[PDB]
Structure 1
């Protein structure tokens, strides 16, 4: 097995934290208690090419709780920029998150995630999400609440870091 450092950035309330704890408990936090600076969480996925460990660096979206922001990014190998499809502002700032990130990590696989798709009253129509295109990033509609496309951001990065397009998740012992 080998591991990687995954920086997870986004605005406040995006669902970053709720996203990661679903992954290591299968439980869903309805509360919004903001992260302070960052909290590193180890995630393990079992693939057909051995185990793989992500070190999720769940950073804080709120300006006052930012901490050592770009400081955290240093030596990252993959990222997950997230926004809230029920809040246009969150998508309008993605470029700021992506900016701070690539000045530190000038070539790493990055995934863009629109969370909250489960919510009926959506404000960021799929038509508008186009930032990823000219930045050669991957995009996914996700839901921390329903598990919609839950593991996608991780399957893609793993496929990229291992260099195997046909890499799969299996959940072996």
Structure 2
């Protein structure tokens, strides 16, 4: 099951993955160079879901590679930063990009990350929910830093993956 993480640079794609994989968080920003692969098999009672995590770069110089990264994805996790309006606005085109590559053969989750920065919120949870409904995708808010909703993010995505 190919799961691609997408979104603007510095929204916390890698940190979400690190938190899910290792229950750790690093405050120091280490930009993803193109793509990094990780594997995690989620061991549910009725199925086994070998996740192939495609951690993609949000930096502009890798943008041309994004279509190739989305190719054949079973799931797309589109991440924004709740403190960054631009990052939220850009999620429509990320989700658009997934749709024109995958049509309906993809599970899409819209993630509003960094809820630990509640003081600096620029996008409300209602705005996030609204966009998800408009774009017919799932929605969740997370904090990679605190750990909040990270396990839930991955569990909900995996639950949504079609059986066949």
Same fold judged by TM-score > 0.5?
A: yes
Higher percent of residues as helix: 2
Within 1, Cα distance between the matches of 2:26 and 2:93?
Answer: 27
Cα-to-partner distance string for 1:73-93 (whole Å, 9 max, x where unaligned) = 111111100000011110010
Deviations 1:92-136 (A, max 9, x none): 100111111111111111000000001132111223222111221
Query: Is the counterpart of residue 30 in structure 1 residue 27 in structure 2?
Result: yes
For the pair shown, the structure with the greater C-alpha radius of gyration is 1
Q: State the 4+ residue runs in structure 1 displaced beyond 3 angstroms.
A: none
How far apart, CA to CA, are the structure 1 residues paired with 2:98 and 2:32? Answer: 19
Q: Which residue of 2 aligns with 1:102?
A: 99
Q: Which residue of 2 aligns with 1:111?
A: 109
Aligned to 1:83, what secondary structure does the other structure show?
Answer: strand
| Structure 1 unaligned residues grouped into runs of 5+ | 164-173
Following superposition of structure 1 onto structure 2, how do residues 124-163 of structure 1 map, counting pairs within 5 Å?
124-129=123-128, 130-163=130-163
* 1:37–1:59 CA contact under 8 A, matched in 2: yes
- Determine the structure 2 residue equivalent to 1:170: none
Aligned length: 160
- Structure 2 length normalisation: TM-score? 0.91
